Write a structure and sequence with these properties.
Organism of A, B: Betacoronavirus Erinaceus/VMC/DEU/2012
Chains A, B: Spike glycoprotein,Fibritin
Bound molecules: 2-acetamido-2-deoxy-beta-D-glucopyranose
Number of helices of chain A: 0
Keywords: spike protein, viral protein
Oligomer: part of a larger assembly
Distance between the termini of chain A: 14 Å
Strand content of chain A: under 5%
Number of strands of chain A: 0
PDB class: viral protein
Shape of chain A: globular
Entry title: Cryo-EM structure of EU-HedgehogCoV (Erinaceus/VMC/DEU/2012) S-trimer in a locked-2 conformation
Chain lengths: 41, 41
């Protein structure tokens, strides 16, 4: 389970399309299998 | 055929969604007819 938090304040939040951006894949990113966030669903 | 290249280095790459942005049309853009890139296809 992965959550988004602010840079200057710690508060775990659900991942949404309004706080993440689509980027070109890299080999360093995690390869999630289950419990994908709604941007990834 | 049009390819994308970096600003500080030269490498012809295919045009994807991740290296282009959708903008308001202008008269000084190229009006392509055939062999559209995948963002325009
Ligand atoms: C995810 O998979 C790709 C290709 O299968 C691999 O290159 C990448 O290292 C993987 N990411 C990991 C293991 O975090
Ligand atoms: C592209 O098409 C527009 C019409 O939508 C035109 O105004 C413009 O002059 C054209 N530019 C060219 C031919 O590159």
């Amino acid at each position: 389970s992965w959550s988004y938090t602010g840079s200057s304040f710690y508060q775990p939040e659900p991942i949404t399309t309004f706080n993440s951006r689509f980027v070109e894949p890299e080999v360093t990113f995690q390869n999630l299998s289950n419990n994908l966030p709604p941007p990834l669903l």
